[PDB]
Short mmCIF file of N, CA and C in Angstrom, two decimals:
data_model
loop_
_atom_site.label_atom_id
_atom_site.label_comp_id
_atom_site.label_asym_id
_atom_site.label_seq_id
_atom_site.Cartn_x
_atom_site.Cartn_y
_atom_site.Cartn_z
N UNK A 1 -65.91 75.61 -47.87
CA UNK A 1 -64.51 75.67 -48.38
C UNK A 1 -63.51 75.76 -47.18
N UNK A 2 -62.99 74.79 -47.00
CA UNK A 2 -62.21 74.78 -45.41
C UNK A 2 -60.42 75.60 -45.62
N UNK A 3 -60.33 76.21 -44.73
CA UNK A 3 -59.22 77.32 -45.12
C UNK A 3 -57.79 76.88 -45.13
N UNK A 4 -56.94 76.93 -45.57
CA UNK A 4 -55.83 76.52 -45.82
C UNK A 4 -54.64 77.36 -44.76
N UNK A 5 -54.60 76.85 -43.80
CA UNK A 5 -53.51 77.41 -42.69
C UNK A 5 -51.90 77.41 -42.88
N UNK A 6 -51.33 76.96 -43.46
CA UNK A 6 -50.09 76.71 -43.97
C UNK A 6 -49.16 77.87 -43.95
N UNK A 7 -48.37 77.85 -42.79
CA UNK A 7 -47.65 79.00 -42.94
C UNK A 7 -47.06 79.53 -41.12
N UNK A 8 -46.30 80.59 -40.70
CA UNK A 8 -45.86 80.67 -39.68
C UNK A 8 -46.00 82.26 -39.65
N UNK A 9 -46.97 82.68 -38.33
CA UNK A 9 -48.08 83.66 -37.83
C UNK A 9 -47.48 84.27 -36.55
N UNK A 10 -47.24 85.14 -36.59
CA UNK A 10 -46.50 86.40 -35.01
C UNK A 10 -47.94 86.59 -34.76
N UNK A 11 -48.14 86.87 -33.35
CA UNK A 11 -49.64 86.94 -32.33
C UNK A 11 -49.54 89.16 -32.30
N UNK A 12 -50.94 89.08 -32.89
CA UNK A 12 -50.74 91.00 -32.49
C UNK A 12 -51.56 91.26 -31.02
N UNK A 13 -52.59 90.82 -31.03
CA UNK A 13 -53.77 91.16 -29.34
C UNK A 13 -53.96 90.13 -29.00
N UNK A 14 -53.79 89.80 -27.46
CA UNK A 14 -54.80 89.02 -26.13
C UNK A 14 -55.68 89.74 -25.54
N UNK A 15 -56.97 89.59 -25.95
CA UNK A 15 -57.90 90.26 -25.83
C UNK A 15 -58.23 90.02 -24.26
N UNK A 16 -59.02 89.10 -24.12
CA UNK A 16 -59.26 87.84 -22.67
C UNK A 16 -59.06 87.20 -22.25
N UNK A 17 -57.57 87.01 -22.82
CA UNK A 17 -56.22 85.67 -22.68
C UNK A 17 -56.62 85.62 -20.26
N UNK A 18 -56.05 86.67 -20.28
CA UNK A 18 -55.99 86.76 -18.51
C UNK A 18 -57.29 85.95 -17.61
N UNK A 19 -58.59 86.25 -18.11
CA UNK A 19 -59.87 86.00 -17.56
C UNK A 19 -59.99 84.09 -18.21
N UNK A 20 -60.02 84.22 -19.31
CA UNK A 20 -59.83 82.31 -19.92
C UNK A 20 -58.54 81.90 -19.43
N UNK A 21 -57.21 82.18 -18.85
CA UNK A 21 -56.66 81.07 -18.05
C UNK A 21 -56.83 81.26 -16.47
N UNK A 22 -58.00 82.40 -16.08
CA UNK A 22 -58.62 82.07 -14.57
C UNK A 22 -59.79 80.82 -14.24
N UNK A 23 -60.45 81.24 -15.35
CA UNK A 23 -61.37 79.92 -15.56
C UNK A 23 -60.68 78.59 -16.25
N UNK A 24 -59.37 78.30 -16.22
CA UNK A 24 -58.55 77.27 -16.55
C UNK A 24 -57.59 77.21 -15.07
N UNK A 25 -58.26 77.86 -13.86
CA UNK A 25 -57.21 77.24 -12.50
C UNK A 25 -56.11 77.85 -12.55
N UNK A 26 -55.49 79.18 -13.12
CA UNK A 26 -54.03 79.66 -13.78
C UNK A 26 -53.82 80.71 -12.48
N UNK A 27 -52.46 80.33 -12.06
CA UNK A 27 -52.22 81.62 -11.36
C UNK A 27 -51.55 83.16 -11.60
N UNK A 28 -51.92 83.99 -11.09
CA UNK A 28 -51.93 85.57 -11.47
C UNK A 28 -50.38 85.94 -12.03
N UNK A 29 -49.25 85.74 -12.14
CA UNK A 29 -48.17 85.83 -12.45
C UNK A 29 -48.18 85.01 -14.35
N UNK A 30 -48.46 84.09 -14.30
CA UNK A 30 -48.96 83.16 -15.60
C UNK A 30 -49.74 84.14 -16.42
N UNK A 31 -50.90 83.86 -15.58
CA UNK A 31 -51.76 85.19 -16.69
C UNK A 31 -51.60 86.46 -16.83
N UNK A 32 -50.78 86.99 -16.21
CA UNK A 32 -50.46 88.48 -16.00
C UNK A 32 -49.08 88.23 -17.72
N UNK A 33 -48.31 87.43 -17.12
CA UNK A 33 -47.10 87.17 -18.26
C UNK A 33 -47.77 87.04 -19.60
N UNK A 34 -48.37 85.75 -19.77
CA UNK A 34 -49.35 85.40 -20.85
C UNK A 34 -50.16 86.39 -21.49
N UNK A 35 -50.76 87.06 -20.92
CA UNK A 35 -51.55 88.46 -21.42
C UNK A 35 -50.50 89.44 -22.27
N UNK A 36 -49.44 89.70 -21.74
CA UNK A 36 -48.33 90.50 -22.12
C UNK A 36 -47.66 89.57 -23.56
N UNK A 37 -47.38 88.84 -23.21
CA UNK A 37 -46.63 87.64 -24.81
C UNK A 37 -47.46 87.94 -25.62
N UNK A 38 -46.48 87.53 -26.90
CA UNK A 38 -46.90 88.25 -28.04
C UNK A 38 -46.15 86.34 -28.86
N UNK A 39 -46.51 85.17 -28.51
CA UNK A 39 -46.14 83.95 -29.40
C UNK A 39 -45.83 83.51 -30.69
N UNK A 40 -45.36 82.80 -31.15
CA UNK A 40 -45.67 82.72 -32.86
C UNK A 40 -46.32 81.24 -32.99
N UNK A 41 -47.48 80.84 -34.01
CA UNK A 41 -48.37 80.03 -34.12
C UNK A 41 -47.49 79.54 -35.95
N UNK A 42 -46.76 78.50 -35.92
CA UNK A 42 -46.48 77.89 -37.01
C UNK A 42 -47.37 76.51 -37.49
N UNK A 43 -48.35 76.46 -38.42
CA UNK A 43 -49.56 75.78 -38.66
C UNK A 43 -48.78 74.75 -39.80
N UNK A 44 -48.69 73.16 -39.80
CA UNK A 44 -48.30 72.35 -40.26
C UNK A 44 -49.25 71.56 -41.18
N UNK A 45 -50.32 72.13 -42.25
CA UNK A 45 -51.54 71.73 -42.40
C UNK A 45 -51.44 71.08 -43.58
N UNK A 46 -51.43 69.44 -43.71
CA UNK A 46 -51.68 68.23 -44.44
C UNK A 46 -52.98 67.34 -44.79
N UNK A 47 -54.00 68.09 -45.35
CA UNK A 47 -55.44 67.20 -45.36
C UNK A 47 -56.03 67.55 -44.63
N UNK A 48 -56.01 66.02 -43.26
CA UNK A 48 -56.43 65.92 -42.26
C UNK A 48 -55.39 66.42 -41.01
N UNK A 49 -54.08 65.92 -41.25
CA UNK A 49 -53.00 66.18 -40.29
C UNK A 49 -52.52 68.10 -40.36
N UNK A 50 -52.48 68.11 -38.77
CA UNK A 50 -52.62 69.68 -38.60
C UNK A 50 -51.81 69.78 -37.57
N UNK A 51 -50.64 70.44 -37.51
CA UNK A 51 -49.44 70.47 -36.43
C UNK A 51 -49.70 71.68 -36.12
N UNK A 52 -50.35 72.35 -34.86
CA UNK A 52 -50.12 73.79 -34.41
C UNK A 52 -49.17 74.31 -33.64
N UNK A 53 -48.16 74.31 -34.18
CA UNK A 53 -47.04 74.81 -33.23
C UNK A 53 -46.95 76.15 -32.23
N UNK A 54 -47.33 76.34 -31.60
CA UNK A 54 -47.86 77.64 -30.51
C UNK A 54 -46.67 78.32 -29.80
N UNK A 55 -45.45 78.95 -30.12
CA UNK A 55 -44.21 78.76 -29.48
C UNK A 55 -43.73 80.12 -28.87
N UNK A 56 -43.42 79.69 -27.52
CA UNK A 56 -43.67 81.25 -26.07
C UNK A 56 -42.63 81.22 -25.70
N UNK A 57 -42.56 82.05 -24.99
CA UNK A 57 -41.18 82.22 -23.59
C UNK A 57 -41.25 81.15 -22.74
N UNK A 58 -42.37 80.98 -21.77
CA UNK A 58 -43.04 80.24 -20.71
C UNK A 58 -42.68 78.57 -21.25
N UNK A 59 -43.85 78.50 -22.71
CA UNK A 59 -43.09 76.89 -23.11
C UNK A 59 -44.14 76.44 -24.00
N UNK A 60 -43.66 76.44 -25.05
CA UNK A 60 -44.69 75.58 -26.19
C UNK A 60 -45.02 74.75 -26.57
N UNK A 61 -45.85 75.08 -26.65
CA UNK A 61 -47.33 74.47 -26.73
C UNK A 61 -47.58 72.66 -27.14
N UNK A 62 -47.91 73.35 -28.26
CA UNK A 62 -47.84 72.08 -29.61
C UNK A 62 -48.98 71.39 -29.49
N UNK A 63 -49.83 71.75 -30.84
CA UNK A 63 -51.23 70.54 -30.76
C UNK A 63 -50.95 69.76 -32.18
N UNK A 64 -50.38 68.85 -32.04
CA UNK A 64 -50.65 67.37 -33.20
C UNK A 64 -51.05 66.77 -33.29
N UNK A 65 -52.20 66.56 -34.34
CA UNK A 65 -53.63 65.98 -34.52
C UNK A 65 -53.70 65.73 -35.82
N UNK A 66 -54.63 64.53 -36.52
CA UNK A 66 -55.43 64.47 -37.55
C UNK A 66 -56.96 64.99 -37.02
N UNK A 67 -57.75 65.81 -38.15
CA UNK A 67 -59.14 66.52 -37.81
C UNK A 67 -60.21 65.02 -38.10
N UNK A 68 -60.89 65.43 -37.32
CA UNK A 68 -61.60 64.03 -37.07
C UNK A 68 -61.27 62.85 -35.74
N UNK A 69 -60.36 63.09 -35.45
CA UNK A 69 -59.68 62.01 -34.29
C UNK A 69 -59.24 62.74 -32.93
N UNK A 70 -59.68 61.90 -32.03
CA UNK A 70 -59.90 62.55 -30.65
C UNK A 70 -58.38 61.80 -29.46
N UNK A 71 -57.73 63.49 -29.05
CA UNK A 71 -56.19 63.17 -28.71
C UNK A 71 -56.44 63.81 -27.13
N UNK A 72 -55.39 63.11 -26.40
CA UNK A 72 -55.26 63.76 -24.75
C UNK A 72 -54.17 65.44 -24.18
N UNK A 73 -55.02 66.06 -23.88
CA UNK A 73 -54.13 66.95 -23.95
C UNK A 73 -53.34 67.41 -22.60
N UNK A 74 -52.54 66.42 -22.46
CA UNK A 74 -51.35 66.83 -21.09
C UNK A 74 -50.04 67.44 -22.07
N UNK A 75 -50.63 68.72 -21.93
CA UNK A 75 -49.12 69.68 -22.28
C UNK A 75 -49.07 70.56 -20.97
N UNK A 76 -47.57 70.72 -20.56
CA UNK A 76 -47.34 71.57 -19.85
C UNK A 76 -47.06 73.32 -19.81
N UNK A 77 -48.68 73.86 -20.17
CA UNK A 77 -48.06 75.43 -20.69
C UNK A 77 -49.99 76.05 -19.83
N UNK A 78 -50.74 76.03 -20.88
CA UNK A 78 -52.00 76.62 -21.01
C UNK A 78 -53.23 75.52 -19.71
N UNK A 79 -53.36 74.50 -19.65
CA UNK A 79 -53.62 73.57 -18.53
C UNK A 79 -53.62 72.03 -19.01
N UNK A 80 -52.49 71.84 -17.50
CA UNK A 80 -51.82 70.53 -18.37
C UNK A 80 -52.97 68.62 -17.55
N UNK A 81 -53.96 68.90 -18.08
CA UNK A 81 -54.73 67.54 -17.53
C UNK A 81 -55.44 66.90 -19.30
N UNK A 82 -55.62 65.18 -19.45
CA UNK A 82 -55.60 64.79 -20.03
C UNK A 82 -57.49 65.25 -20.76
N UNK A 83 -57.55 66.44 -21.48
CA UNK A 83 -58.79 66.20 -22.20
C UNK A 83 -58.84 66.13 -23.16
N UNK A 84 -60.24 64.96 -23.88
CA UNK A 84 -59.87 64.28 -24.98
C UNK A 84 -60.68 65.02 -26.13
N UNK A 85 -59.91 65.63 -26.88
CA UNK A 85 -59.90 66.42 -27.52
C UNK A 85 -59.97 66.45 -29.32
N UNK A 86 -61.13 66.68 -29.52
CA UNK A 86 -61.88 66.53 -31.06
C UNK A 86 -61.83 68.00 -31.96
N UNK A 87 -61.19 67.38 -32.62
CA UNK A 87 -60.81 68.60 -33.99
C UNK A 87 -62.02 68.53 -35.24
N UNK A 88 -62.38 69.71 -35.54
CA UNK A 88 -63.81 69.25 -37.19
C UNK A 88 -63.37 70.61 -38.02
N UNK A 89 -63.89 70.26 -38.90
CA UNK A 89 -64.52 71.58 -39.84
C UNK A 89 -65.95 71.77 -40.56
N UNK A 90 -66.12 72.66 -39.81
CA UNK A 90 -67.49 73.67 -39.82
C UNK A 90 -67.72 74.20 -40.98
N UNK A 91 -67.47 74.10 -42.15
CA UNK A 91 -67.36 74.36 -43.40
C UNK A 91 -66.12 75.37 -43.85
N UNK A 92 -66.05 76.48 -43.59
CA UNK A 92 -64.95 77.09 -43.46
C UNK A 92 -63.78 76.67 -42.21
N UNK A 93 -64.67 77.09 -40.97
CA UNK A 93 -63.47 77.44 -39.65
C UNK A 93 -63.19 75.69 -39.32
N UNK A 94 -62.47 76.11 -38.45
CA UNK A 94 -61.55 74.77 -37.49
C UNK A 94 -61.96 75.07 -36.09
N UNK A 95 -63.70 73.87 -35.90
CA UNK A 95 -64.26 73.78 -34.75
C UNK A 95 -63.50 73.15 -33.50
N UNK A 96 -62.49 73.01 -32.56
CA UNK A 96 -62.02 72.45 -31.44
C UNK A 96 -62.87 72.29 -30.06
N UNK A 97 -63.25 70.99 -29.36
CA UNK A 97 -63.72 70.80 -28.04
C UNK A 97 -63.00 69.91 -27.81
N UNK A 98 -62.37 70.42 -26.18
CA UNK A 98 -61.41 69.94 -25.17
C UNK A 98 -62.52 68.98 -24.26
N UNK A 99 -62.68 67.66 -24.16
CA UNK A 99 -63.62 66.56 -23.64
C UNK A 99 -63.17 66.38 -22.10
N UNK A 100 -63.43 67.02 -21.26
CA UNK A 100 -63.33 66.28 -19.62
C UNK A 100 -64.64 67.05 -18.61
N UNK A 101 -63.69 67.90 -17.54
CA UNK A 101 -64.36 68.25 -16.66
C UNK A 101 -65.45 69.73 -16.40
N UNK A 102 -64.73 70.83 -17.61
CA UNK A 102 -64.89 72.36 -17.50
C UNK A 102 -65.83 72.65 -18.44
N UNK A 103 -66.86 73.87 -18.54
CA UNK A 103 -68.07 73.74 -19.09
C UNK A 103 -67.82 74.85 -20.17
N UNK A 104 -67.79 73.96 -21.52
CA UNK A 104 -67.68 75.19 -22.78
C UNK A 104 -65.36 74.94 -22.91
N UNK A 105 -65.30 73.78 -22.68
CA UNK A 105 -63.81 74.06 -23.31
C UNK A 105 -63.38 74.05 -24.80
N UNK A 106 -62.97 74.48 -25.73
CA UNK A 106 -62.42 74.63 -26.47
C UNK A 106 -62.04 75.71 -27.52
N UNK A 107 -62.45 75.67 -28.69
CA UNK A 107 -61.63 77.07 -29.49
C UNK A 107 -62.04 77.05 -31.33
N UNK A 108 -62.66 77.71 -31.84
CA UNK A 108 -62.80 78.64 -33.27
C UNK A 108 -61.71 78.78 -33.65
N UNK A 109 -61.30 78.42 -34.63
CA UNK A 109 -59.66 79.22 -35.51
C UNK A 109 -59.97 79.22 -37.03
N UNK A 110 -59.95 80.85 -38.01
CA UNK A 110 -60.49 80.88 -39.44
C UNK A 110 -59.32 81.93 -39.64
N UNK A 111 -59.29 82.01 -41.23
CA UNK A 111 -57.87 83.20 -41.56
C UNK A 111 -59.43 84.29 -41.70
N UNK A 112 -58.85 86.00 -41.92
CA UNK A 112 -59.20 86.74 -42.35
C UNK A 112 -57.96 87.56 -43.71
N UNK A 113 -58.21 87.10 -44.76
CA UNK A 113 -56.58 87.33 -45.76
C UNK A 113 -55.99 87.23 -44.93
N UNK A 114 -54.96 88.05 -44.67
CA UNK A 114 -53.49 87.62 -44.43
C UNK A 114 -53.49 87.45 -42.26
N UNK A 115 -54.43 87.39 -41.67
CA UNK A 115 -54.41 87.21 -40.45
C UNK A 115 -55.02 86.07 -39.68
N UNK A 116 -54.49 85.33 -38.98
CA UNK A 116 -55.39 84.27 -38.20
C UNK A 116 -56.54 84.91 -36.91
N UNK A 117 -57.63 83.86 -37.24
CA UNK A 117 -58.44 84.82 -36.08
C UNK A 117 -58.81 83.28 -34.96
N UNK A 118 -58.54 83.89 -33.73
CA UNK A 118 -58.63 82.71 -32.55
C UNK A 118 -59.40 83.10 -31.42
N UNK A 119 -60.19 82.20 -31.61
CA UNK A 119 -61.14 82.49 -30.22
C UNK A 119 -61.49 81.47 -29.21
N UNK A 120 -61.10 81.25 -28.45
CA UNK A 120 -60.67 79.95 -26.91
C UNK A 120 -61.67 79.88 -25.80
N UNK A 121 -62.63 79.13 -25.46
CA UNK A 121 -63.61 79.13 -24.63
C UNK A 121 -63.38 78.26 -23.24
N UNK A 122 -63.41 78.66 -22.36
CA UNK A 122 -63.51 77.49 -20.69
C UNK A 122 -64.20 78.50 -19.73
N UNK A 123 -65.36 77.45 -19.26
CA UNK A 123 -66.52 78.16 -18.37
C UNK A 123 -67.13 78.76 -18.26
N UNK A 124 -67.46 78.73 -19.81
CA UNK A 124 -68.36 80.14 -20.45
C UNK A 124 -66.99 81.12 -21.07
N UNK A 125 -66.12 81.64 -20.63
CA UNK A 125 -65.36 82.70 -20.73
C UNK A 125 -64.31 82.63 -22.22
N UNK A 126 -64.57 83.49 -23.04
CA UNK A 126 -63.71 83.91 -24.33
C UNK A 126 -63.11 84.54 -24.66
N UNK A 127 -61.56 84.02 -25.03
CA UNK A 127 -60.55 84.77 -25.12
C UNK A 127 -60.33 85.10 -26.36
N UNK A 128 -59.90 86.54 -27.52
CA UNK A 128 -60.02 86.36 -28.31
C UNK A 128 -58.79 87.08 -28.78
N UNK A 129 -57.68 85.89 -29.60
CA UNK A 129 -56.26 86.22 -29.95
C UNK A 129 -56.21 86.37 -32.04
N UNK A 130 -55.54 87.68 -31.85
CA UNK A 130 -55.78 88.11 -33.54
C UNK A 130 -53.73 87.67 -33.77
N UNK A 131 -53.82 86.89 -34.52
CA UNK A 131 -52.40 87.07 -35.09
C UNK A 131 -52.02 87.50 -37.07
N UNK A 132 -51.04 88.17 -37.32
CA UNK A 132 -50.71 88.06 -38.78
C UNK A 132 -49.56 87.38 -39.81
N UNK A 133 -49.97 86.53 -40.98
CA UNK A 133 -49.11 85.79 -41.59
C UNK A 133 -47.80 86.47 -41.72
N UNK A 134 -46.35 86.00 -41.67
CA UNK A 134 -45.30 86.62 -41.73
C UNK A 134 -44.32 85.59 -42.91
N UNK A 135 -44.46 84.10 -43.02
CA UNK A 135 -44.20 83.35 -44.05
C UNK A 135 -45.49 82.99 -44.59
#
């Protein structure tokens, strides 16, 4: 039963946010800031079409995708090089792998009732961000 994301989410914990953008090349001021932000995640979810709006101080984000179809990800925020990047569903959750150079890139995203649960992988290393529905 694949979960229905629809709606706009304030971020409560960065668990390992700091350690997953060291193993993403990030320098100590970035992740020091980033660890501290608290973002809002507005989820645009149509079928297949899934707008994650990710929106910071620093500079947002934005992943726009249909699930199933593989997109380049040069955004300038989290690490900005082109990996080609495949969205699925795992029966419930929303499986993500980032396709290039780094070993174990991508990210888990499932609701728990009223909270999103996110968990982000590069080089082995897992970051794990809890946010709660607010619309």
């Amino acid at each position: 039963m694949p979960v229905d994301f629809n709606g706009y989410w304030k971020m409560l914990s960065n668990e390992n946010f700091e350690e997953y953008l060291r193993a993403l090349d990030v320098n100590v001021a970035l992740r020091k800031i980033a660890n501290l932000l608290k973002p809002d995640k507005e989820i645009v979810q149509d079928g297949d079409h899934m707008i994650i709006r990710t929106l910071s101080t620093f500079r947002n984000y934005i992943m726009d995708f249909q699930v199933g179809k593989e997109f380049e990800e040069d955004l300038t925020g989290i690490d900005d090089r082109k990996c080609m990047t495949t969205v699925s569903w795992d029966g419930d959750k929303l499986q993500c792998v980032q396709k290039g150079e780094k070993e174990g890139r991508g990210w888990t995203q499932w609701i728990e009732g009223d909270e999103l649960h996110l968990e982000m992988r590069a080089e082995g290393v897992t970051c794990k961000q809890v946010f709660k529905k607010v619309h």
